[PDB]
Design a protein around this motif. Structure first.
Motif, short mmCIF file in Angstrom:
data_model
loop_
_atom_site.label_atom_id
_atom_site.label_comp_id
_atom_site.label_asym_id
_atom_site.label_seq_id
_atom_site.Cartn_x
_atom_site.Cartn_y
_atom_site.Cartn_z
N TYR A 148 0.78 -1.23 0.00
CA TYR A 148 0.00 0.00 0.00
C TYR A 148 0.82 1.28 0.00
CZ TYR A 148 -3.76 -3.18 1.39
OH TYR A 148 -4.67 -4.21 1.45
N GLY A 149 2.10 1.24 0.31
CA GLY A 149 2.92 2.44 0.34
C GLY A 149 3.25 2.88 1.75
N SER A 150 3.77 4.10 1.84
CA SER A 150 4.19 4.65 3.12
C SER A 150 2.97 4.95 3.99
CB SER A 150 5.02 5.92 2.91
OG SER A 150 6.24 5.63 2.27
N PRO A 151 2.97 4.52 5.25
CA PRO A 151 1.85 4.84 6.14
C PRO A 151 1.98 6.23 6.74
CG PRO A 151 3.40 3.44 7.28
CD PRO A 151 3.95 3.64 5.89
N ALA A 152 0.82 6.86 6.98
CA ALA A 152 0.81 8.16 7.64
C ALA A 152 1.28 8.05 9.08
CB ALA A 152 -0.59 8.77 7.57
N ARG A 153 0.77 7.05 9.81
CA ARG A 153 1.19 6.79 11.18
C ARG A 153 1.25 5.29 11.40
NH1 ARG A 153 1.54 11.37 14.05
NH2 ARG A 153 0.02 13.06 13.78
N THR A 176 4.51 9.40 6.34
CA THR A 176 3.91 10.63 5.82
C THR A 176 2.90 11.23 6.79
OG1 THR A 176 2.70 11.57 3.95
CG2 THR A 176 2.21 9.27 4.53
N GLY A 177 3.33 11.42 8.03
CA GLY A 177 2.50 12.03 9.06
C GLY A 177 3.09 13.34 9.53
N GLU A 178 2.23 14.32 9.77
CA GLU A 178 2.65 15.65 10.20
C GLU A 178 2.77 15.67 11.72
OE1 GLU A 178 -0.76 17.90 7.99
OE2 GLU A 178 1.12 18.39 6.97
N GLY A 179 3.96 16.03 12.22
CA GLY A 179 4.22 16.15 13.63
C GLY A 179 5.44 15.35 14.02
N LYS A 180 5.62 15.17 15.33
CA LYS A 180 6.74 14.42 15.88
C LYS A 180 6.30 13.14 16.58
N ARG A 181 5.01 12.82 16.55
CA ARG A 181 4.51 11.58 17.15
C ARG A 181 3.94 10.70 16.03
NH1 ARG A 181 1.93 11.83 23.07
NH2 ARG A 181 4.06 12.65 23.22
N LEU A 219 10.77 1.21 20.03
CA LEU A 219 10.10 1.04 18.75
C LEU A 219 9.67 2.38 18.17
CD1 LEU A 219 9.82 -1.75 17.51
CD2 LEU A 219 7.37 -1.58 17.84
N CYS A 220 9.17 3.29 19.01
CA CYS A 220 8.84 4.62 18.53
C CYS A 220 10.06 5.29 17.91
CB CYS A 220 8.28 5.48 19.66
SG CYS A 220 6.67 4.95 20.28
N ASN A 221 11.18 5.30 18.65
CA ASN A 221 12.39 5.94 18.14
C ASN A 221 12.86 5.27 16.85
OD1 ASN A 221 12.73 7.95 20.18
ND2 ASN A 221 13.52 6.38 21.58
N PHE A 222 12.88 3.94 16.82
CA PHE A 222 13.42 3.21 15.69
C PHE A 222 12.57 3.40 14.44
CE2 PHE A 222 13.88 -0.85 13.29
CZ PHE A 222 15.22 -0.73 12.96
N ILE A 223 11.24 3.27 14.57
CA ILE A 223 10.36 3.47 13.43
C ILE A 223 10.44 4.90 12.93
CG2 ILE A 223 7.98 3.34 12.62
CD1 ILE A 223 9.02 0.66 13.01
N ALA A 224 10.45 5.87 13.85
CA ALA A 224 10.48 7.27 13.44
C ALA A 224 11.78 7.62 12.72
CB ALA A 224 10.27 8.18 14.65
#
Lengths: 1000, 88
Positions: A451-456, A644-649, A633-638
RNA sequence: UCACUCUUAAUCACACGUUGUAGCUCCCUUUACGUUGUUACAAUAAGAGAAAUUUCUCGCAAAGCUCUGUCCCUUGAAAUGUAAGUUUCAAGGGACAUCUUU
């Protein structure tokens, strides 16, 4: 085009559920796109919980130890042959070496006897390793060795051989250690002293083969043990002044002090004190750095263990291994005052060269002879650095002024995201968590490819992920505790409300619990509440004391049972704010006395009487998983993947409690069957936790507290859509039929959910079963082993090879088990005296499928098959098993499992037969027969019956034997074909192999 | 090439070990096994002197064999790799 | 009330256990095999690679896709041919290994 979707994940020690939920250009989900589940075998021993590599490690240790024993025996044999003691390698040397060794004392032994005792000493040399440190196993061995050393210092035992022939074989009847005993183990030094004494005595007694050089070589054998941006210039040795100084500089400039978020580097005035501690102290610890500097309790160093002194008192920063090693060797035997430029040469001399002559020639000029003696006798340097010599002498004066590695390097020398990289295994000790995150990474990559890049990416981590074996086992224990507690609570509720209409709702049990805990009185008002009126609607409600909109706390510590009379006046404030506790009114003090007099736990009491809101911290703690795996996991995935999500979370790891709340109020709480599909459920809900959804929930809670008619859902008919998409066999038909008013749910991506199981196609494994039988009975197919009496039960008794030879033995052993109620140890714990002593007698067992081991003189059971070749012969299916021992030998079997006959004559897969395909464990197969069709994962082959077991993809209780179809015969079946599945459960299609592959 | 105690640390280097990757699995495994084993034995050739259970004369005897044994293995390693044409 | 089963040991080593052949020894079946206890020696995964009966290293795990192989998929190019459909090569994306690491 590519969609705008959020990917939800549900991770557990053995599974990864995943959901793909479309969102709009706001943070608002629209419809469920895709859903699936991937299972894998828990990356640990299924029962013991040890590491899967521990058995391999122990096997390596045993193989190496036996190999060293054989090698040193070969060297001893060759040395004796060269020194003419041994006429040739193989002579039948005597077998009474113990009596020969004592006879070697006070008498002379011939060449054969002397060679025999010498080789026996080399073969059985003893233990070397203060004392009493860690283990009970060691403890026992060391106690035995120490007792033997104490015994040896008497006139009656001149040597361990005399001790064995005097103390051992008169009170126990045996020389060697028996079973799990260490009372007969000897020290290496004691046996070396014995060998020296034998050489000295035999020398004076006329033995020609007792040379000094022979003694020295035999001591060498019996004592030996294996020890445990630049130019063309080579790298520097680790144990040198410059390299150790470099490493100390890096560690000193990588120091950060954390004081409740005030994480700062050292004051430059403070750094001078720490500059040279390691020269004064051999191993400065974190205690030293905290004590010397101006620090305090609420201050700790990065990489903390965690104040508790042992965490900091026993943690070394930099160990001047070379510096203090050279200091001790020079002081024990110039002075320690040395110039760096000489220390570097000493380190390079002992790291590049290990012989005396080479290092003497390299350091002849700038070293005096006594220093040569002191360094030569007691020094050994091993490893090297990855930086050249010339680089260090320039980089060191710069970083001593407070620089960094790359910055100084740039001063001297100025001059992949689309998918998830592999898991950084150095940051994860747990093999189970490592496999869970590896499979999560595979699932994420598959979803991105589809499906491509996820937003979150939203994450729901299971409670048992990131825990040790014992922690999860105790969690299971208290889970069953809670199970019995809740069923007993239902029973008590039925006792207190006998006229109820069946199974209680979840609210009623907690209503009864709160009624009990607040002592039949409301907290806020203090009015008495009547138990008989408790269950009518509107009489009482379970209220969040601290408002949910302000705290997001759904825990038991926030719930109080409250009459609907007073909540109509409160709103969504706190009891301190509600009861005017700032002025210390009568209302607040009465309420505080009422809550403090309740049976509440202390934490609940203080949470009710909060006086402080701390909204940001409390909500952030309650909404996000704060555990190590979630943060990593948050740090590694980010950092390592494109979102393609707007923000830092862009990555959200929700607390499991809020996930449970959402799953409950969204209607699908107990929508989990006993199959593996239920994991997907959580993914879906965690995929719907966008910030807009949480704001909607907060506003609805504000409504129900003080200010939509029902709890917000992602869309209309969400519960049933999720349930159908996860658990329906044909979700298209069910979605179109049972839910007509929601055409949006049935789209092009709607497919039946197929659970994808991890492949297991490794060709390497355990060769055979550890129990080794004797192979001279295979011509009749029986297994003769030694059978200990203390282990022999009644069944093993009759299967003996001596009831046909000793009926007295059989009858007496039979009645012994009768008097102990079939207990072997109780009967034969007393030395069984045959009409001699009997401890173990040979037995017979079933053995018609074995591996030939121990130079062809032993047999063992097959351990595990690694392949099954499906053939077609005569229009019928045949299955050839392939085990690991066949793979190692490189043989390709042609015998297929046939029933009521053994491998001596099976059905031969000859030229008449056609090779269909090959199957590895946990491979997908489709079998159509005259009755039904099964598409399931292959789960083994029965060698006796010739039948197979195949695993249902989700393990339904309604299908097979608890999810597996056991004993399916395929000889007369219609079609039996191999298939393939993607990691996402997609692309189930036929695969047709061309040729039968070799085993190697 | 010829290996002694003088050049063993100079030839048993990461660059030479890394450039063994191009070899096929058939010969790469024994050559790396010999070469890595030689490095480990030689790097700890003087380790015997740091144990209280070994006499100095015995430690001298062990050190000579450790260097002699490790030099022999790398000579075999180069000889077999040079047989396969290695730019050592 | 459209809520809930969320109050570390490593690496060196030791000693067994088992199998087989010998020396002792206990029992004991038929018209020479078993076989108790004890000692010695060989073996202690099945084995594989390379170089000389002998030497090294690997040999029950995890992860990985750079090389090799298996399988699945998309795309293009050639020979075709009772005009249907085959046969072959090229390259792109994945899953796994008998492949690669540690």
């Amino acid at each position: 085009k590519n969609l705008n979707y959020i990917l939800g994940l549900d991770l557990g020690i053995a599974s990864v559920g995943w959901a793909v939920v479309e969102i709009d250009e706001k943070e608002n989900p629209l419809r469920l796109i895709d859903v699936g589940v991937r299972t894998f075998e828990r990356a640990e021993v299924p029962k013991t919980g040890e590491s899967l590599a521990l058995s391999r490690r122990l096997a390596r240790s045993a193989r190496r130890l036996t190999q060293r024993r054989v090698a040193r025996l070969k060297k001893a044999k060759r040395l004796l042959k060269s020194e003419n003691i041994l006429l040739s390698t193989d002579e039948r040397l005597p077998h009474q070496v113990w009596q020969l060794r004592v006879e070697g004392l006070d008498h002379k032994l011939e060449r054969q006897e002397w060679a025999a005792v010498l080789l026996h000493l080399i073969k059985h040399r003893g233990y070397l390793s203060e004392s009493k440190s860690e283990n009970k196993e060691l403890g026992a061995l060391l106690s035995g060795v120490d007792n033997n050393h104490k015994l040896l210092q008497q006139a009656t035992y001149r040597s361990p051989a005399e001790l064995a022939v005097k103390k051992f074989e008169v009170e126990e009847g045996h020389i060697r250690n028996q079973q799990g005993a260490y009372t007969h183990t000897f020290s290496r030094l004691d046996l070396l002293a014995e060998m020296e004494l034998l050489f000295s005595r035999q020398q004076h007694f006329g033995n020609p083969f007792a040379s000094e050089k022979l003694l020295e070589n035999l001591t060498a054998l019996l004592m030996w043990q294996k020890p445990a941006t630049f130019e063309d210039e080579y790298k520097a040795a680790k144990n040198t002044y410059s390299a150790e100084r470099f490493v100390w500089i890096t560690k000193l400039n990588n120091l950060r002090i954390q004081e409740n978020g005030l994480e700062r580097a050292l004051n430059d005035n403070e750094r001078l004190a720490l500059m040279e501690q390691p020269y004064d102290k051999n191993r400065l610890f974190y205690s030293q750095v905290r004590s010397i500097l101006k620090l305090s309790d609420e201050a700790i160093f990065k990489g903390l263990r965690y104040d508790k002194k042992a965490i900091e008192t026993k943690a070394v920063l930099m160990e001047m291994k070379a510096y203090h090693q050279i200091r001790k060797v020079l002081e024990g035997n110039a002075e320690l005052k040395a110039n760096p430029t000489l220390l570097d040469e000493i380190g390079t001399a002992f790291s590049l060269y290990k012989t005396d002559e080479d290092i003497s020639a390299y350091l002849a000029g700038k070293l005096s002879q006594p220093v040569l003696n002191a360094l030569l006798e007691n020094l050994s340097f091993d490893k090297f650095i990855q930086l050249s010599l010339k680089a260090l002498y320039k980089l060191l004066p710069l970083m001593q002024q407070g620089l960094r590695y790359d910055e100084a390097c740039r001063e001297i020398y100025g001059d992949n995201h689309h998918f998830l990289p592999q898991i950084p295994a150095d940051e994860i000790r747990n093999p189970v968590v490592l496999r869970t995150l590896t499979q999560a990474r595979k699932v994420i990559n598959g979803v991105v490819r589809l499906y491509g890049s996820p937003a979150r990416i939203h994450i729901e981590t299971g409670r048992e992920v990131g825990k040790s074996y014992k922690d999860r086992r105790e969690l299971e224990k208290r889970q069953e505790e809670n199970r019995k507690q809740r069923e007993n609570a239902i029973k008590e509720f039925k006792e207190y409300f006998p006229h109820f209409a069946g199974e209680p709702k979840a609210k009623d049990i907690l209503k009864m619990r709160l009624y009990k805990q607040q002592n039949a009185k409301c907290l806020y008002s203090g009015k008495p509440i009547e138990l008989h009126r408790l269950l009518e609607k509107g009489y009482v409600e379970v209220d969040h004391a601290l408002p949910f909109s302000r705290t997001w706390d759904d825990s038991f510590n926030n719930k109080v049972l409250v009459l609907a009379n007073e909540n109509q006046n409160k709103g969504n404030l706190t009891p301190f704010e509600w009861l005017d506790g700032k002025h210390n009114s009568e209302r607040w003090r009465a309420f505080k006395a009422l809550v403090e007099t309740s049976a509440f736990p202390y934490a609940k009491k203080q949470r009710i009487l909060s006086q402080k809101l701390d909204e940001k911290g409390f909500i952030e703690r309650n909404l996000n998983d704060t555990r190590y795996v979630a943060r990593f996991l948050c740090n590694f995935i980010a950092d390592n993947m494109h979102l393609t999500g707007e923000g830092k979370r862009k990555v959200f790891a929700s607390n499991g409690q809020i996930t449970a709340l959402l799953r409950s109020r969204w209607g699908l709480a107990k929508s989990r069957e006993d199959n593996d599909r239920h994991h997907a459920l959580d993914a879906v809900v965690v995929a719907c936790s966008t910030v807009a959804m949480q704001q909607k929930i907060t506003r609805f809670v504000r409504f129900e507290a003080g200010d939509p008619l029902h709890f917000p859902t992602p869309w209309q008919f969400f519960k049933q859509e999720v349930e159908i998409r996860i658990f329906s066999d044909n979700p298209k038909l069910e979605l179109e039929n049972r839910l007509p008013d929601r055409p949006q749910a049935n789209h092009e991506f709607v497919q039946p959910l197929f659970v994808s199981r991890m492949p297991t196609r490794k060709m390497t494994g355990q060769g055979h079963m550890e129990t080794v039988k004797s192979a001279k009975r295979l011509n009749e197919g029986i297994s003769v082993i030694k059978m200990p009496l203390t282990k022999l039960k009644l069944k093993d008794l009759e299967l003996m090879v001596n009831r046909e030879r000793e009926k007295d033995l059989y009858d007496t052993l039979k009645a012994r088990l009768e008097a102990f109620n079939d207990d072997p140890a109780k009967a034969f714990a007393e030395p069984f005296i045959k009409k001699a002593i009997v401890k173990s007698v040979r037995v017979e067992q079933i053995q018609k499928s074995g591996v030939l081991v121990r130079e062809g003189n032993g047999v063992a059971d097959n351990a595990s098959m690694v392949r099954v070749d499906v053939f077609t012969k005569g229009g019928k299916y045949f299955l050839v098993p392939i085990y690991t021992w066949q793979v190692a030998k490189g043989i390709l079997p042609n015998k297929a499992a046939t029933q009521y006959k053994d491998e001596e004559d099976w059905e031969v897969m000859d030229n008449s037969a056609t090779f269909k395909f090959s199957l590895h464990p946990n491979d997908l197969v489709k079998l159509v027969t005259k009755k039904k069709t099964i598409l399931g994962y292959f789960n083994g082959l029965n060698r006796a019956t010739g039948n197979i077991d195949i695993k249902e993809h989700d393990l339904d209780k309604s299908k097979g034997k608890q999810g597996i179809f056991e004993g399916v015969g395929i000889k007369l079946a219609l079609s039996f074909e191999k298939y393939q599945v993607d990691e996402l459960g997609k692309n189930i299609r036929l695969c047709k192999p061309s040729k039968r592959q070799p085993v190697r | 090439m010829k290996i002694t105690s003088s050049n063993f640390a100079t030839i048993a280097t990461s660059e030479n070990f890394a450039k063994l990757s191009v070899l096929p699995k058939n010969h790469r495994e024994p050559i790396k096994g010999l070469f890595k084993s030689a490095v480990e034995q030689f790097s700890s050739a003087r380790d015997f002197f740091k144990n209280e259970n070994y006499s100095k004369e015995l430690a001298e005897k062990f050190n000579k064999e450790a260097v002699n044994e490790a030099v022999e293995k790398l000579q075999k390693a180069i000889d077999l790799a040079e047989k396969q044409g290695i730019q050592f």
